[PDB]
Amino acid sequence: RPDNTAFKQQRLPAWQPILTAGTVLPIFFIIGLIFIPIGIGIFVTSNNIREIEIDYTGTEPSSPCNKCLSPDVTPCFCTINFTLEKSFEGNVFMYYGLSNFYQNHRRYVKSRDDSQLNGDSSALLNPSKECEPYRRNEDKPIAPCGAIMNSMFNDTLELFLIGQDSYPIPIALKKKGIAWWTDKNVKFRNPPGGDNLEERFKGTTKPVNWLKPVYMLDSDPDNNGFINEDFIVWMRTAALPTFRKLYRLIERKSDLHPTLPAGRYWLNVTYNYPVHYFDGRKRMILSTISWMGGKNPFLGIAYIAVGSISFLLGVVLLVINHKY
Amino acid sequence: TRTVFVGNHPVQRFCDNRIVSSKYTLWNFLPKNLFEQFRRIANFYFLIIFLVQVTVDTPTSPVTSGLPLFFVITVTAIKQGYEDWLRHRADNEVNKSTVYIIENAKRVRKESEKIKVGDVVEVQADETFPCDLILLSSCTTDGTCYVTTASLDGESNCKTHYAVRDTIALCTAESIDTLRAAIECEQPQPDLYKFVGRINIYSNSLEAVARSLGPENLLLKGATLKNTEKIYGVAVYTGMETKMALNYQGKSQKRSAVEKSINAFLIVYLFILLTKAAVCTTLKYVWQSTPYNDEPWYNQKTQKERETLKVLKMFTDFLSFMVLFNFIIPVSMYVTVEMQKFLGSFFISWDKDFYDEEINEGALVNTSDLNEELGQVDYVFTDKTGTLTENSMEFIECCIDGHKYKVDKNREELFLRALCLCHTVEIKTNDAVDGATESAELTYISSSPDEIALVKGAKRYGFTFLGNRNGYMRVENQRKEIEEYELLHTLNFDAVRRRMSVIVKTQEGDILLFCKGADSAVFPRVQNHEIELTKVHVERNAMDGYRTLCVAFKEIAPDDYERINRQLIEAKMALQDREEKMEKVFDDIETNMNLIGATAVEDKLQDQAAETIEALHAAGLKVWVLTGDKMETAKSTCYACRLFQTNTELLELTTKTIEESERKEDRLHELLIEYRKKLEHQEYGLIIDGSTLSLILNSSQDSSSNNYKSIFLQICMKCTAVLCCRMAPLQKAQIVRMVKNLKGSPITLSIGDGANDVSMILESHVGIGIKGKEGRQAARNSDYSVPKFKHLKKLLLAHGHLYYVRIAHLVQYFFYKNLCFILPQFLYQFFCGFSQQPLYDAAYLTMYNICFTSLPILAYSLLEQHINIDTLTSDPRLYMKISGNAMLQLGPFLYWTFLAAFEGTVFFFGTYFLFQTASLEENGKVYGNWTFGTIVFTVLVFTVTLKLALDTRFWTWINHFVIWGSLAFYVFFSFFWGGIIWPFLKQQRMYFVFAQMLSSVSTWLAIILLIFISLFPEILLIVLKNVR
């Protein structure tokens, strides 16, 4: 009489998986065969990626350009010698790291007005109440308001190749295409309408620290206003104190030559961005790239430390079980 | 103590008949519902954390703490609100039906809500009652009209009530004729079975007939009338005072053992969510000690914030590091753990095995809360007669004057008269086809089978009872002589006394006083010189395992009767303590009875009532038995019941060993310490009495050096099976208490059959009412009910277990789900300037606790059997022992936690080392911090779920759709929310975070691994437990 439905009787069609030792021991020996062929598969593509980080912060009495670690004429000029042992083959990328620069600071991550950079005309002339400390100077609206876009890393690097003679061959750098294409054509747009990138900025001005207006960051109209890669890559926050943001990438020449022939080079940095104050270093990381990304050992030493500690207990299990 | 008048006019001061079963209304719903929620800890705390977000300037927008709190409410209010509205629309029906009244010679047709106290009602057949009437007359004479209380206590037979003699003549004869009466009844008591009243009808000129009343005249409000044409009643209670309506309240039992742990975890978290704040505040104002390490020229403190009183600012932080870690208290537990119970309690009412064919009904769960309290019992107080042995008695081997009749007609003939009288048989009035059956229809309808087997016995001999015809009684004494007997007083039976009696008047002579009852309570009042002659017989018939009952008559002298008669009736009109004041009037009426002969009735065991009790033992319970029959009998049915193996060194405390005041203790301490303290294991069981017991508990205040009771109790815990014979109706309660209150809180599961057991079922942690033959007085109070005893096995093990392992692994996971989700966001308050920068987004702080990972734990809550429901009831070895609440004890709890911490750390530090690379994609680009949220999130939603897919040992088709139905949701949400949802937002901070967190082939290998290294401390216990 009571409902003999499949469910109410509480005996629905089950799977009932029998998880037991005799049927789980292979669970260890099945991975060990599949991680290690990766833990080592990766570890190879890691140590086969050459990099170099030329700490050029200063603070070194023998540092080549300590001369301008202190306040001097704005256009300082460093020059750092360094030698490449194993030439780079592929197309190399040139980062510019940092340290103790807490770009992830709740009081410093809110400091962007994301709806302005997107190009919302009305929002432009009167930015939000979030980029407060750098919102209005001289009672005027700032185009890229907020601390984040304000303290935009503003020193120019350069690399020269020293041939047999003393004349250094200038290495060619590229700047376009260094920011996520997703947030370089969709999330950052110039003001609504205009022809010359200046007019569009009528009531706004430059930030406090900056030296030139945003409509003059570059001549190429495709990169000037709120689209400047240098600017974009500076906005996506650091995600950690010790970070490093893409600066410029050298496209691997079509020919079969090493994009970076070994030897010693010249690195003359127009030192402008001062970080000695908060005890923050600076660097310039040159690097290649493999499908894994940039040189990083962790993924390697991790797999090989898991793909060989699971595949071991199985032994101590397989041997302990039969002996009982 | 009240007063009434039939026509409301003698020779509004009372309640009004509108039954309001609901609790809320159409106006005070919110101000009541909300409060009844926000008084709960976790539903209130989350409120504070809302205000603090609306006034103070805090990291996470108010949405991420007001939505997952406004939702968990709106989904409880609706259910808890609607589920109520069912009553309103239900109620409105009952108290808005048609019920005719009699104003003045008028058969008015009013609404059942309009009735007032003291006014004539009318009722046809098949119709429910308007209110508690007092049957005053029916269409026919005999003033009788059956009733079927099929809605109050679940009874399904046709009981028979009685009208008032002095009024039976009134039927359509204009009873409205200013009919005088005074209906005084004790203020409405919800006992539903006792009713003390009185009537003072007035004749034409003068009359004060004091026609006493009784429960046999009350017609409850809701007992469908049956087998009659119509009646006329006089309302006495008018709704919300009626006996039924008072019985909506039994909530003072739903305090499970898994409802305080849920309150011992929070009290922990609420004391961890501070350390997580204090330890992470101090480190800030100690970190900011550096002068440049704050506002180092690249985030200049907003001028205002600079001029703030330091101490105050030292507050707004500590109030920020709660609003930022508040998620460490599960917000959506007080809806799941309730939605579970509701959606998952019926299972104990549908299981076909809880369905006896005969009773044509199944189990019944009268409490949707104590479910989880079944896989906890540690003491099981069965009842011998009614549960262990169905009530089908067969009179065999009587004994008259110790002659064991098979004397001739000097006293034997009298004896038979005793059997056929002094009872409440009430043979089936209707007449069936007689001539084809054995004798006739002759179907006896009574409640106490202890006698229905007697009558059927005498029916095997000469005499036979077939009467109760018009105040008389008919019998056939081996020939054709109806031999009417005039019944005068039917002294109802009362357990506390163990004797029912009847005072008949010999049709052609003097009076007689028949009576019967247990020997231990009939012998004290006898011509003692006759006891031993028959005592031995009553021993054997008991010694072999038959019920026993003695019967004796005492001729009364007429001159003496009037004293009794007056003394008897006058002992009824007393409205105060009637039953007591009455009980005591005839307790001295059975002064000295001339014993005639004893009787013996046999009983049968149930289907598995001998197999079950062999299971319970193997399950670890300590089954007791609280009988009421003679000691010998219980000791006999016990062996058969199989709770006393062949070799068990009993420790009996019967009257046969303690016939003194001090003797026992001497014997007590002996067989306790020198007998059961110096030491298969079951070698010892106990046996007590209703007298030997009372001496111990009540009289324990003497030897305060080593108190008697404190000694006795000590034996209880160390005896696997104990008995209790000659138990009174209340001593079956003092026992429970005396046990419940010792060495912790042993969860006592009692199980009764009839009225006698109402005194413990209402007292033990979780009653079990067996709806048997006697009645539903037991099954209506019990939390559950099962129309058998063989079911108490499939109930405890096969359900009491799953209804625990289905929650113990919910209140656990429902915490570990969070203490991981909020650990990273605490570490990441180390590699940031302690500026409370929420690691995750905000769209991933509301969702995660209501949408991403809500269902997968509900699914595993309702439908799951970590051990096949067959292998669990077919093997009681430990599966009711492996969980003695251990699933939530301090041992396991802090394992999950020390599993969150690890599985928590590996989430963050597992990622941190992964962002020492300078890039992860192949184009060489970089990854922001938000892309540090989804990683350490997408690696979260894939663990707190999979960690379940390593626990579900019963994969139905739902689980397959929920678990893989949340994951494949998450991986979609981030794809949609990720994309264009700009217009109304203000941040566009996660515009394309996810879609780029997947195009980095070197990222998966971090997820596909960080998952494993987080589960590897779980994939191990499987192996280390499936190996031995």
Ligand SMILES: Nc1ncnc2c1ncn2[C@@H]1O[C@H](COP(=O)(O)OP(=O)(O)CP(=O)(O)O)[C@@H](O)[C@H]1O
């Ligand atoms: N009609 C009757 N005639 C004589 N004695 C009766 C009787 N009805 C009840 N009794 C007495 O009442 C006692 C009831 O026993 P008690 O209630 O203590 O245990 P029990 O065996 O009845 C279990 P349960 O209460 O579930 O039926 C019996 O010992 C019996 O002698």
Ligand SMILES: *[C@@H]1O[C@H](CO)[C@@H](O)[C@H](O[C@@H]2O[C@H](CO)[C@@H](O)[C@H](O)[C@H]2NC(C)=O)[C@H]1NC(C)=O
């Ligand atoms: C580059 O940006 C850094 C940021 O600290 C800044 O120090 C350099 O000089 C600053 O120029 C700003 C005014 O034009 C303003 O920030 C300030 O005068 C000066 N630095 C200080 C001490 O505040 C910037 N250099 C360039 C090229 O403008």
Ligand SMILES: *[C@@H]1O[C@H](CO)[C@@H](O)[C@H](O)[C@H]1NC(C)=O
């Ligand atoms: C780098 O800059 C210097 C500035 O003097 C300039 O001579 C040349 O462009 C580079 N190399 C040297 C010589 O420093």
